[PDB]
């Protein structure tokens, strides 16, 4: 019944792993089967785990009484992961990266044995790329935080307005209907008298 | 709704000073709109009936046509940008019922609210349903 | 199943019927048409479709089985139910949320 045991670390680390295709699946069920791992026999693993677990008392499944979820309106919240770096620092870094200093830094990057001249500049060039990617994320997050503050204010004001006016309309309707019923009841009582 | 579709007949009389129609609060509100638009001389509420005093001009009546849109067997609703297109280039009165009361299509268009199209008065030949 | 076109989904009739159908958490309202079985009720729910060709809305009935932990929904009571995402047993698929109108008992 159970699947072969595998660490939660492997579960997490396989998050972006593309599952096998048709031919790659066919390569996993051939007879030479050299790829099978430890304690990973298709025919035996589930039964082995079941038998090992039977040696102890089984904990019963959870008793699940269905209940209805409450209804809550969606509320926009402040952005969480916003860097605090300064726009001045971001501007200096962008000026360096997008100016003529990046090309000179690439030219000045040192070489390691086994790499062609292009690669050693490419790796330094990619090092600057990881920096600019981080700079864009900070600016986007800060701007998004500002826009979200504005939007939250707008939504709060709209909600307050709608709630208040609907409450007033309901109060007016209830008062009118109550007065109508108040007169009707006395009229009916007099008729029954 | 049935009472309004009935009152259409009483409103479309010719060669008559006044005509009676069935009573209903919706009828009273539509009559209020008509009088504010200056299409009837007036009206009177008498128990189960309403007596509409009609208005004429140079022999012919002021109300030359009534087109019913929303019938009790079928509602008709419009968004503001559909109401604008449907009432395009027309001097007629299209009566609209909204959460803000029974008003004219021009009030509805300025308010940008969704409404239910009841009647069209002096709208010539302009309808879609 | 019926598919509405992009321009059709912007019309007032379509939007209003969609608004009528929709509720928070996809809840529905109906009345009890079966209360023999324990902790279970069959509920008939009003559902509306907008026909573009004739520009009017017609009503049909949706009958589903819900779960009633207690015994408070009898035959002819108006109730609000919520979907589960799973089928308890062979029938039940919703869960009672609240009782709106109760037919007199005893």
């Amino acid at each position: 019944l159970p699947n072969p045991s595998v660490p939660r670390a492997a579960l997490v680390a396989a998050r972006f792993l593309r599952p096998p295709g048709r031919f790659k699946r066919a390569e996993l069920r051939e007879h030479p089967r050299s790829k099978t791992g430890a304690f990973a026999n298709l025919v035996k693993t589930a039964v082995r785990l079941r038998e090992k677990a039977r040696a102890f008392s089984l904990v019963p499944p959870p008793r699940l009484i269905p209940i209805p979820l409450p209804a809550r309106k969606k509320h926009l919240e402040s952005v969480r992961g916003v860097p605090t770096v300064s726009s001045d620092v971001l501007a200096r870094r962008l000026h360096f990266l997008l100016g003529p200093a990046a090309i000179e830094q690439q030219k000045a990057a040192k070489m390691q044995r086994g790499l062609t001249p292009y690669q050693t500049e490419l790796f330094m060039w990619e090092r600057q790329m990881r920096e600019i990617r981080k700079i864009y994320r900070a600016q986007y997050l800060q701007r998004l935080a500002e826009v979200t503050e504005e939007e939250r204010q707008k939504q709060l004001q709209l909600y307050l307005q709608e709630k208040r006016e609907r409450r007033l309309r309901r109060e007016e309707q209830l008062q009118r209907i109550y007065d109508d019923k108040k007169r009707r009841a006395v009229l009916k009582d007099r008729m029954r008298i | 709704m049935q009472r309004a579709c009935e009152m259409v007949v009483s409103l479309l009389r010719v060669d008559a000073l006044s005509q009676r129609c069935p009573f209903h609060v919706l009828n009273v509100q539509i009559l209020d709109l008509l009088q504010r638009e200056g299409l009837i001389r007036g009206f009177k509420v008498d128990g189960t009936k309403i007596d509409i005093l009609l208005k004429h001009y140079k022999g012919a009546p002021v109300i030359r046509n009534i087109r019913v849109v929303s019938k009790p067997s079928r509602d008709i609703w419009l968004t503001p940008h559909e109401l604008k297109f449907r009432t395009r280039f027309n001097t007629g009165l299209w009566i609209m019922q909204t959460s803000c009361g029974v008003i004219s299509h021009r009030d509805c268009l300025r308010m940008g609210i969704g409404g239910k199209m009841l009647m069209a008065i002096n709208n010539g030949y302009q309808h879609f349903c | 199943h019926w598919h509405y076109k992009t321009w059709q989904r912007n019309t007032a009739g379509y939007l209003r019927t969609f608004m009528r159908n929709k509720l928070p958490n996809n809840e529905m309202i109906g009345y009890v048409i079966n209360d023999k079985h324990p902790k279970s009720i069959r509920v008939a729910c009003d559902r509306f479709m907008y026909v573009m060709r004739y520009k009017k809305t017609f009503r049909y009935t949706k009958k589903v089985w819900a779960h009633d932990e207690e015994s408070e929904a009898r035959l002819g009571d108006v109730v609000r139910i919520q979907p589960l995402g799973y089928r308890i047993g062979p029938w039940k698929n919703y869960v009672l949320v609240r009782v709106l109108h109760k037919e007199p008992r005893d």
């Binding site: 209907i177 | - | 309202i29 009345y31 008939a44 009003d46 109108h101």
Partner: peptide, 19 residues
């Protein structure tokens, strides 16, 4: 008021009697 189905009629009632 268009759709006077059973549920609609049950929910649309202000009082027992319409005097």
């Amino acid at each position: 008021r268009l759709h006077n189905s059973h549920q609609a009629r049950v929910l649309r009632r202000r009082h027992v009697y319409r005097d």
